[PDB]
């Protein structure tokens, strides 16, 4: 009634927030998953990195999980907060 049915995508806000919460919960409490975020912490906190740091970070992330899993390159740019996500599933192997 308020939005003239333009707010229909907000009908499941509780369920989507619950699913996000569940995904965060299994994000810290899974083996071969939390150390990837720890590596992200070390990469983000330690700035002024060259390219070779980026490839060794890539294979160090790869070595944590299985050889058949999928990698995702979620690029962030401070200027413009533009998150480009790239599909490199079984590409760097």
């Amino acid at each position: 009634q308020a939005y003239n049915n333009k707010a229909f995508k907000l009908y499941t806000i509780d369920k989507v927030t619950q699913s996000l919460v569940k995904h965060a919960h299994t994000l810290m409490t899974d083996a071969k998953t939390a150390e990837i975020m720890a590596l992200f912490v070390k990469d983000r906190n330690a700035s002024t990195t060259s390219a070779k740091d980026q490839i060794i970070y890539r294979l160090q992330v790869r070595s944590h999980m299985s050889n058949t899993e999928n990698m995702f390159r979620i690029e962030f740019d401070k200027r413009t907060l533009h998150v480009s996500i790239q599909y490199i599933a079984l590409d760097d192997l």
């Binding site: 995904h23 890539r58 979620i74």
Partner: peptide, 25 residues
Amino acid sequence: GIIQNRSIFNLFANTNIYIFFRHWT
């Protein structure tokens, strides 16, 4: 080839962090 004061930051992730970030977006 040192990139000082970097602005583009890369997150490498499996399906779990990707799906979590997709739900956030």
